[PDB]
């Protein structure tokens, strides 16, 4: 009986999590312990930090007898995960100090079982401390809205200034073709709460970011119907996709200075 | 100019 | 209060009009007056004339205090209009002798307002007189049918001969692989009148055209469920997308000689 | 009255058959006789044999007064067939010792008739005898499943070993990233018989194949909801798409040795 | 050969 | 190595 054995009722969530990170992270460790499967990695260009946790509770069931780091090239992992259908049952297994990650995908449509032994790699990356931050401003908004805003602005500029104040949260750009801004205001939608805009303002704040990285983060849009963006002077932007239960995918982006 | 991420976090 | 202020209930129509012309026209003036927003421009290669009018009546509301030419690079305009959702409310504003076109897009889904100040350019283009023509033949047909005919023929030939006579309208090509023709005949569809073929024949006519440009015109297919093609010796082909009310998008194509 | 006149109620089937073969075969003869329209051709690289028959019964009606070979470049044929809508009526005509194949497409949506005269070519290819084979193992399975298995495995390896025994049919690969296998087991789905896995095992067998060619064969997936794969030592793999009635599209693939 | 468009219209 | 197809079939 291997040290790690973690079963997902549907492969979809793991496919989507990896899809949301693979354009940013070449290789990383999946840290497996009693609490679940976590990942922390800087992006290739060292402008962002990816922080992920799939809690044990999201599995059915989850067993991890001893702490296991699974060092993985995400392109390699993608070539295996592609074989899993969204509706496949998916099981991860690994021995102590493993050489491979064992992935088994069971079709829910016919009697087909896929089994992969993915070679692991040795990854030396230091764990970074994410401090407790009281943000000057946060905004929760529909995920796809954030995706469109950032993607569309990126067509006219490499940079975006994000300002939060009493009049809302404004994304503004200046480029060759002119100026653009997108303003979101505190808003409640009773029937469709995912369309609400919830702004928590402690203190006005204004910071500038690379749109390329924000757009990359929006590859997580399928994971959550809402996104939370957190701003403070002197700290990275936090773009948070809170998942079911206490699972999360978070991106921290260093500002321009 | 774009800041690097490391300068915002401490090593554990 | 700016000289021009023109509100569309839905951005869709303007998105689609620009999409239908941007592959042909690099830069042009939008001529704004009491009657509406018009555009006339030769295509980049001076083989075709684009003639467009969005009548005041299509707006809700429309105000233009004095005549205004808005000189615009269509690639630049596209980078802004992309930000508008089809279902956004869209307002164009401009001052007298403007430096920018002000575009405001209001989401109908959440409390999001996009605002762009698009830099204008100075465009010296002479206005061409489009004369009154009694065509030898016209055909009204389903838009998408015309799109497929032209696109599919273009796979085997650069040129198409269009002949109108008592036996209908024939598009014919000769190429390396052989010969192709597509014949449309006078036809009434009672339930689905957009599928009708209405041919008005004054006089047999036969002319040859570049398929590349016809295919380009079919980027207007989404604007109207029917297209009208008008042929006469000694005049350009007219490919007409008549819109709601008296608004239109028209393309005139010089023949091969 | 031409020697060949063959009418399809819907162009779809011929479009799909050519689409399933054109990436493998540059040029070939369509052999027309009393029984129907057949094709046999090696693929460009001489690793596979394509064997096709559209029986007379699939047409409405079919007439072939004398045997006719129609030598065709499939890229050229594709440029014509693209013009046919799936729902068009399609008629093939050809004279004795023809110079062209005449194709007529009649729209079922409006009064549009497309007519093409596709230049033929002289093709000298010897007819190969396909012998009677009692396969060591066959498996019938959902077409799209086979498509995904082969396409997904091809991401990690150029080669696949196919083994049939009492424990089912296993596709296995070994590559840079690790090992992969997909196992199918005898399975009945009462409601959805296309999802059944039917394995006929005479004798255990194991052979290795190029995934590239298997993936190419899966361009036939739209023709049939199930595929039959037949394995024997010393013979090519047979991948069979049996169509309505006694029509078929079959691919034979030489093994690696 | 392809004709140019200008020769079909007069300048206003 | 990949075998060619011809060696599996006879010419008619
Ligand atoms: Na996939
Ligand atoms: Na509100
Ligand atoms: Na858009
Ligand atoms: Na009719
Ligand atoms: Na087509
Ligand atoms: Na079963």
- The DSSP secondary structure of A65-77, one letter per residue, reads SS-EEEEEEHHHH
CA angle C45, C50, C55 (to 5 degrees): 160
Tell how far the Cα of A88 is from the centroid of ligand 6, in angstroms.
16
CA distance C138 to C119: 41
Are the C-beta atoms of residues D196 and D139 closer than 8 Å to each other?
A: no
Find the ligand nearest to A155 CA.
Answer: 3
Please tell me whether residue D221 adopts helix, strand or coil conformation: helix
- Give distance in angstroms: CA of A112 to centre of ligand 1: 14
Angle between helices A74-81 and A12-21 (to 10 degrees): 150
Can you read off the two tokens belonging to residue A47?
A: 């402008």
Asked if the C-beta of C195 comes within 8 angstroms of chain D's C-beta atoms, the answer is yes
> Measured at the alpha carbon of residue C41, what is the angle toward residues C68 and C58, in degrees to the nearest 5?
55
- CB-based contact C195 D119, cutoff 8 Å: no
To probe the interface with C, which of A145, A179, A180, A199 has the most C CB atoms within 10 Å? Answer: A180
Find the distance separating the first CA and the last CA of chain C, reported in whole Å: 52
Residue C223: both structure tokens together:
């604007």
Nearest-by-CA chain C residue for D84:
C152
How would DSSP label each residue in A200-243? EESS-EEEEEEHHHHHHHGGGGGG-SEEEEEE-TTS-EEEEEE-
> Mind giving me the DSSP string for D70-135?
EEEEHHHHHHHHTTS-TTSEEEEEE-SS-SEEEEEEE-SSSSEEEEEEEEP-----PPEE------
Q: Strand, coil or helix: what is A23?
A: coil
Contact D85, D107 (CB under 8 A): yes
Inter-chain residue contact A197 with C111, CB threshold 8 Å = yes
N-term to C-term CA, chain F: 28
CB contact under 8 A, B1 and A257: yes
User: Pairing relation of β-strands F10-11 and E10-11?
Assistant: unpaired
Look up residue D183 and give its two tokens: 């196992």
Distance CA D79, CA D221 (A): 21
> Is residue A48 within 8 angstroms of chain B, CB to CB?
yes
Residue of D nearest to A105 (CA): D182
- Using a CB-CB cut-off of 8 Å, the residues of chain C touching A199 are none
Q: Which residues of E touch C129 (CB under 8 A)?
A: 9-12
Q: Of B7, B8, B11, which to mutate for an interface test with A (greatest number of A Cβ within 10 Å)?
A: B8
Which pair of tokens denotes residue A253? 């982006």
Chain D environment of A79 (Cβ under 8 Å): 155-156, 177
Judge if the upstream peptide bond of residue D15 is cis by omega within 30 degrees of 0. Answer: no
Q: Are D181 and D175 in contact (CB under 8 A)?
A: no
Q: Are the C-beta atoms of residues A39 and A29 closer than 8 Å to each other?
A: yes
Distance between start and end Cα atoms, chain D: 52
Distance from CA of D154 to the nearest CA of C (A): 32
Element (H, E) at D147: helix D143-154
- Could you tell me the two tokens for A152? 């569309």
Could you tell me the distance, in angstroms and rounded to a whole number, from the CA of residue C95 to the centre of ligand 3? Answer: 27
Beta bridge partners of A256: B2
The answer, yes or no, to whether the previous bond of D61 is cis (omega within 30 of 0) is yes
> Which chain D residues contact residue A100 at CB under 8 A?
178
Please report, to the nearest 10 degrees, the dihedral formed by the alpha carbons of residues A216, A220, A226, A231 taken in order: -40
**CA gap D136, D231 in Å, rounded:** 6
Instruction: Tell how far CA D114 is from the center of its chain.
Output: 26
Closest by Cα among C215, C236, C230, C206 to E5: C236
CA distances from D93 to A157, D6, D125 (A): 58, 7, 23
* Cβ-proximal residues to D174 (8 Å cutoff; 6+ apart), any chain: D157
- Contact F/D (≥3 CB pairs under 8 Å): yes
The approach used to solve this structure was X-ray
A252 interfaces chain B, CB cutoff of 8 Å: yes
Contact A138, D208 (CB under 8 A): no
Task: Tell me the sheet residues that pair with A4.
Answer: A64, A94
Q: Any chain D CB within 8 A of the CB of C27?
A: no
Is the CB of residue A76 less than 8 Å from the CB of residue A119? Answer: yes
The count of CB pairs under 8 A between chains C and D is 69
Distance between CA atoms of residues C68 and C94, nearest Å = 8
Query: In angstroms, how far is CA D46 from the centroid of its own chain?
Result: 16
Nearest of D162, D148, D154 to residue D253 by alpha carbon = D162
CB C224 within 8 A of CB C242: yes
> Which ligand has the minimum distance to the alpha carbon of residue C82?
3
Which residue in the block uniquely carries the two structure tokens 């927003």? Answer: C37
Q: Which of A47, A49, A255 sits opposite B9 (nearest CB)?
A: A49
| Segment holding A15, helix H or strand E | helix A12-21
Name the region of D152 (left: φ>0; alpha: ψ -120 to 50; beta: rest).
Answer: alpha
| Cβ atoms within 10 Å, residue D225 | 14
- Positions of E strands within chain C: 4-8, 27-33, 36-42, 48-55, 62-64, 68-73, 89-94, 100-106, 112-119, 128-129, 137-142, 159-165, 168-175, 178-184, 198-201, 205-210, 226-231, 237-242, 248-253
Residue B10, Cβ density class (10 Å: 0-12 exposed, 13-18 middle, ≥19 buried): exposed
Q: How far is A16 from chain C (nearest CA, A)?
A: 25
Mutate to test the interface with B, among A41, A236, A238 (most CBs of B within 10 A): A236
- Cβ atoms of C243 and C249 within 8 Å: the answer is yes
Domains of chain C: 4-119 (3.10.150.10), 137-253 (3.70.10.10)
Task: Tell me how far apart the alpha carbons of residues D206 and D231 are, in angstroms, rounded to a whole number.
Answer: 8
Give C127's contacts (C-beta < 8 A, 6+ positions apart): C40, E11, E12
CA torsion sign for A142, A145, A149, A154 is positive
User: Are C184 and C169 in contact, with CB atoms under 8 Å apart?
Assistant: yes
Of the partner residues D127, D236, D256, the one whose CB lies closest to the CB of residue F5: D236
Please tell me which residue of chain F has the smallest CA distance to D235: F8
CA of C188 to the centre of ligand 4 (A): 5
**Cα(A4)–Cα(D241) distance, integer angstroms:** 42
CB contact under 8 A, A49 and B5: yes
Of all helices (H) and strands (E), which one includes residue D144?
helix D143-154
* Nearest ligand to the CA atom of C197: 4
D249/A177 Cα distance (integer angstroms): 56
Which ligand has its closest atom nearest to the C-alpha of A198? 2
Identify the residue among D128, D132, D135, D209 best suited for mutation to test binding to F, counting F beta carbons within 10 A and taking the highest: D128
Q: Nearest 5°: phi and psi at D73? A: -85, 125
How far apart, in whole angstroms, are the C-alpha atoms of residue D39 and residue D32?
A: 9
Query: What does the CA dihedral D212, D213, D216, D217 come to, rounded to 10 degrees?
Result: -140
| Gyration radius from chain E CA atoms | 8
How far apart are the CA of C93 and the centre of ligand 4, in A? Answer: 48
| A94 vs A102: CA distance, rounded Å | 6
Phi, psi of C77 (to 5 degrees): -60, -35
* CA A241–ligand 1 middle distance (angstroms): 23
* Among candidate residues C218, C199, C202, the one with its CA nearest the CA of residue C138: C199
Q: In what order do the strands lie in the sheet with C27-33?
A: C68-73, C27-33, C36-42, C48-55, C248-253, C237-242, C226-231, C137-142, C198-201
Residue C209 DSSP class: E
């Amino acid at each position: 009986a291997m040290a790690l054995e973690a079963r997902l009722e549907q492969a979809s969530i793991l496919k989507k999590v990896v899809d949301a990170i693979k354009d940013l992270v070449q290789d990383c460790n999946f840290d497996c312990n009693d609490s679940g499967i976590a990942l922390q990695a800087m992006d290739n260009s060292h402008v962002a930090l990816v922080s992920m946790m799939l809690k044990a509770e999201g599995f059915s069931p989850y067993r991890c007898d001893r702490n296991i780091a699974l060092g993985v090239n995400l392109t390699s992992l993608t070539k295996v995960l592609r074989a899993a259908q969204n509706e496949d049952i998916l099981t991860l297994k690994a021995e102590d100090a493993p050489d491979v990650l064992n992935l088994v995908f069971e079709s829910s449509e016919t009697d087909r079982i896929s089994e992969y032994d993915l070679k692991l790699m040795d990854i030396d990356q230091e764990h970074l401390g994410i401090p407790e931050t009281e943000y000057a401003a946060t905004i929760t908004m529909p995920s796809n809205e954030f995706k469109r805003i950032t993607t569309d602005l990126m067509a006219m500029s490499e940079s975006v200034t994000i300002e939060a104040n009493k009049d809302g949260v404004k994304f503004s750009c200046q480029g060759d073709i002119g100026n653009g801004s997108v303003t979101l205001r505190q808003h409640t939608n009773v029937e469709k709460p995912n369309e609400s805009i919830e702004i928590e303002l402690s203190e006005p704040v204004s910071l500038t970011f690379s749109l390329k990285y924000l757009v990359n983060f929006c590859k997580a849009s399928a994971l959550s119907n809402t996104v939370k963006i957190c701003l403070s002077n002197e700290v990275p932007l936090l773009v948070e996709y809170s998942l079911g239960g206490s699972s999360y995918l978070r991106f921290y982006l260093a500002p321009k200075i | 100019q774009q800041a690097r991420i490391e300068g915002f976090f401490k090593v554990i």
